């Protein structure tokens, strides 16, 4: 009797994705330029300060005033008290925190299957408090020829968006396909014999296994989504499978829970 561990298998969702990089940006924002030439006497702003359209944010040389062109928060200050500046010199950036946007550049071969409304995950770190849901908002019409990329825009949704701060780098996982209501199982359950693929199903009464042919629909992160003669709640060997054949007698050392029915991502 060969020792095996079996999974009580569940139907669920396995999802494919495209791995991108992007930046948290905002739709509504503006550069702050002076209205005359001269030197900076005072800066009446710090990062994070809220300012109103018209408000005086700095002072130049008489004293001349630099005003905010829109209402919002100060995102960056690119200028030092003491520096000389002119009407095309960027002193600081103002933007709204309620029009957040993720910008990314997708290579052309991937564009035709991306659609407004597609789901994405936005990641700034490894833990779930550092990940955020998003939807594709806009595909630019522009193809940049040198980079062979098209800009795609995502809008974050859901909770705790305070932690998606403007300016941040993010990894993006854009969902491209969902295989739904499929048996999911650890990949090592699948065994390749004579150019085909099988799993071993345990019969509890006879303490044996039956070798069932399967088709692997998709796999990622060591997880197979499969079709074939396998049903919810079948016991399928996930350790010891290499030593088995059809009808092999076994010893069920243990039974693991089925992989979650919810999406890998």
From TrEMBL:
Question: Ranges for the CusB-like beta-barrel domain?
Answer: 106-176
Q: What is this protein called?
A: Membrane fusion protein
Q: Which residues form a coiled coil?
A: none
Q: Which Gene3D superfamilies match?
A: 2.40.30.170, 2.40.420.20, 2.40.50.100
Q: What Gene Ontology cellular-component terms does the record carry?
A: efflux pump complex
Which protein family is named in the record?
Answer: Belongs to the membrane fusion protein (MFP) (TC 8.A.1) family.
Q: Where is the Multidrug resistance protein MdtA-like barrel-sandwich hybrid domain?
A: 29-87
Q: Which GO molecular function annotation, any one, does this entry have?
A: efflux transmembrane transporter activity
Could you tell me which InterPro entries the record lists for this protein? Beta-barrel_RND_2, MdtA-like_BSH, RND_pump_MFP, Single_hybrid_motif
